[PDB]
Amino acid sequence: WRSFHLEASLMDALLNDRPEFVRLLISHGLSLGHFLTPMRLAQLYSAAPS
């Protein structure tokens, strides 16, 4: 698996709950240094229900 594929998987795992997927993703290891760009923070904040 590549960096962008894992980043997209973590993106979906943050948009939706899926705690087991979240657990496995961070357990396997991510960047956490390039995953926190302001644009990504923006779509994370935009996920709040209306």
Furthest CA-CA distance within the chain = 35
Helices (H), 1-50: 3-15, 19-28, 38-45
Q: What's the rounded Cα separation, in Å, for the pair 36 and 14? A: 12
First to last CA, the chain: 35
Q: Is 2 assigned a ligand-binding role in the annotation?
A: yes
Q: What's the rounded Cα separation, in Å, for the pair 3 and 27? A: 15
The residue to which tokens 């998987």 are assigned: 9
Sign, CA dihedral 27-44-3-12, equals: positive
Task: Please tell me what resolution, in angstroms, this structure has.
Answer: 4.3
Q: What's the rounded Cα separation, in Å, for the pair 19 and 17? A: 6
Q: What's the rounded Cα separation, in Å, for the pair 8 and 19? A: 16
Q: Which two tokens stand for residue 17?
A: 């709950």
Q: What's the rounded Cα separation, in Å, for the pair 44 and 48? A: 8
> What's the one-letter identity of residue 50?
S
